Design an enzyme around this catalytic site. Structure first.
Site, PDB file in Angstrom:
ATOM      1  N   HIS A  62     -23.782  10.056  31.773  1.00 47.58           N
ATOM      2  CA  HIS A  62     -24.658   8.892  31.848  1.00 47.58           C
ATOM      3  C   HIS A  62     -24.355   7.972  33.029  1.00 47.58           C
ATOM      4  CE1 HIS A  62     -25.857  10.263  27.948  1.00 47.58           C
ATOM      5  NE2 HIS A  62     -24.639  10.077  27.452  1.00 47.58           N
ATOM      6  N   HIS A  92     -18.216   0.438  35.125  1.00 48.42           N
ATOM      7  CA  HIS A  92     -19.164   1.430  35.536  1.00 48.42           C
ATOM      8  C   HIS A  92     -20.346   0.726  36.203  1.00 48.42           C
ATOM      9  CE1 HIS A  92     -20.569   0.035  31.612  1.00 48.42           C
ATOM     10  NE2 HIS A  92     -21.763   0.164  32.167  1.00 48.42           N
ATOM     11  N   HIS A  94     -24.827   1.047  37.051  1.00 49.78           N
ATOM     12  CA  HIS A  94     -26.166   1.554  36.832  1.00 49.78           C
ATOM     13  C   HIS A  94     -26.864   1.501  38.190  1.00 49.78           C
ATOM     14  CE1 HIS A  94     -25.648   1.199  32.417  1.00 49.78           C
ATOM     15  NE2 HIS A  94     -24.899   0.191  32.777  1.00 49.78           N
ATOM     16  N   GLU A 104     -30.093  -3.449  35.765  1.00 48.95           N
ATOM     17  CA  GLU A 104     -30.517  -3.575  34.376  1.00 48.95           C
ATOM     18  C   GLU A 104     -31.048  -4.989  34.145  1.00 48.95           C
ATOM     19  OE1 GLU A 104     -27.356  -1.770  31.872  1.00 48.95           O
ATOM     20  OE2 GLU A 104     -28.812  -0.096  31.902  1.00 48.95           O
ATOM     21  N   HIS A 117     -20.858  -3.233  35.787  1.00 45.94           N
ATOM     22  CA  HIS A 117     -20.474  -3.801  34.491  1.00 45.94           C
ATOM     23  C   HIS A 117     -18.974  -3.612  34.318  1.00 45.94           C
ATOM     24  CE1 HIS A 117     -24.766  -3.186  32.779  1.00 45.94           C
ATOM     25  NE2 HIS A 117     -24.647  -4.264  33.544  1.00 45.94           N
ATOM     26  N   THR A 196     -25.980  -1.911  26.743  1.00 48.89           N
ATOM     27  CA  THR A 196     -27.279  -1.439  27.208  1.00 48.89           C
ATOM     28  C   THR A 196     -27.426   0.064  27.112  1.00 48.89           C
ATOM     29  OG1 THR A 196     -26.633  -1.075  29.492  1.00 48.89           O
ATOM     30  CG2 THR A 196     -27.286  -3.322  28.930  1.00 48.89           C
ATOM     31  N   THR A 197     -26.412   0.744  26.602  1.00 53.55           N
ATOM     32  CA  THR A 197     -26.491   2.171  26.280  1.00 53.55           C
ATOM     33  C   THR A 197     -26.236   2.368  24.812  1.00 53.55           C
ATOM     34  OG1 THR A 197     -24.150   2.499  26.841  1.00 53.55           O
ATOM     35  CG2 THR A 197     -25.738   2.965  28.551  1.00 53.55           C
TER      36      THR A 197
END
Ligand SMILES: NS(=O)(=O)/N=C1/NCCS1
Ligand SMILES: [Zn+2]
EC number: 4.2.1.1
Length: 257
Positions: A62, A92, A94, A104, A117, A196-197
């Site tokens: 992911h 991590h 995005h 995000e 994040h 958010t995951t």
């Protein structure tokens, strides 16, 4: 058929396995800067990462996580909206397929090229797993990425990505200093939200910095060479691994400035 970012398993489908996706404090959100209110009750934010001890980097199918040794009080976030001390466990990112998308959170509907994040857990709960059963269990420090000049402090991450191209690959990743990923200013917005995951747990105090960091086009292009798939499987580039903005519902976004 597990969750992901595609047509048939992406964010519009997560609510079937994770009904909290339609919950009352989901993230990310659009930050409407004109409706955000300065909060003089916020104390100064303290980011103390000098003794941070990274251990490994992992492609989880992911994103990629840079993981830290959180067995002692070393890299911590305190202050701001937070009560007590929160310990860094991983960071991590995005990002998008193109520079015009990937973040995000959004700022007056503006999408940045990526979002970092830094995930922390509230030490009053002992460890991460107990913290994610609490409404104040986590603090995520979110930092926007724009494309322009290179971020020298990011290059060590960029350069190891070739060794974790595919899902489930990991590598030694010691002595990485996350201070090199922070902008000058610690001015932020804050609100209560969620991961958010999946599993999308509503345990997060979000702290989103106003000042983006700049990364170079070459740096983000190397993120986009990662793969969602595992080795020997058909190539699906790891791009557009962002959840869009969710309904604000009964929340107020507060500004520290
Ligand atoms: N993107 S995020 O940081 O809100 N999601 C997470 N899920 C597992 C721990 S961090
Ligand atoms: Zn994230």
């Amino acid at each position: 058929h597990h969750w992901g970012y595609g047509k048939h398993n992406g964010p519009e489908h997560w609510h079937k396995d994770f009904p909290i996706a339609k919950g009352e404090r989901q993230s990310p959100v659009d930050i409407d800067t004109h409706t955000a209110k300065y909060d003089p009750s916020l104390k100064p934010l303290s980011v103390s990462y000098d003794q941070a001890t990274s251990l490994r980097i992992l492609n989880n199918g992911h994103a990629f996580n840079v993981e830290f040794d959180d067995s002692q009080d070393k890299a911590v976030l305190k202050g701001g909206p937070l009560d007590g001390t929160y310990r860094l466990i991983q960071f991590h990112f995005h990002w998008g397929s193109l520079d015009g998308q990937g973040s995000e959170h959004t700022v007056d509907k503006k999408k940045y090229a990526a979002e970092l994040h830094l995930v922390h857990w509230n030490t009053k709960y002992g460890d991460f797993g107990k913290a994610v059963q609490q409404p104040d269990g986590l603090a995520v420090l979110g930092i926007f990425l724009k494309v322009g000049s290179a971020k020298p402090g990011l290059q060590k991450v960029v350069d190891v990505l070739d060794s974790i191209k595919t899902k489930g690959k990991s590598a030694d990743f010691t002595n990485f200093d996350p201070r090199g990923l922070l902008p000058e200013s610690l001015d932020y917005w804050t609100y209560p939200g969620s991961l958010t995951t999946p599993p999308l747990l509503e345990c997060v105090t979000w702290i989103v910095l106003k000042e983006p960091i700049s990364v170079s086009s070459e740096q983000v292009l190397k993120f986009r060479k990662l793969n969602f798939n595992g080795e020997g499987e058909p190539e699906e580039l790891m791009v557009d691994n962002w959840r869009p903005a969710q309904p604000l519902k009964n929340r107020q976004i507060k500004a520290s400035f």
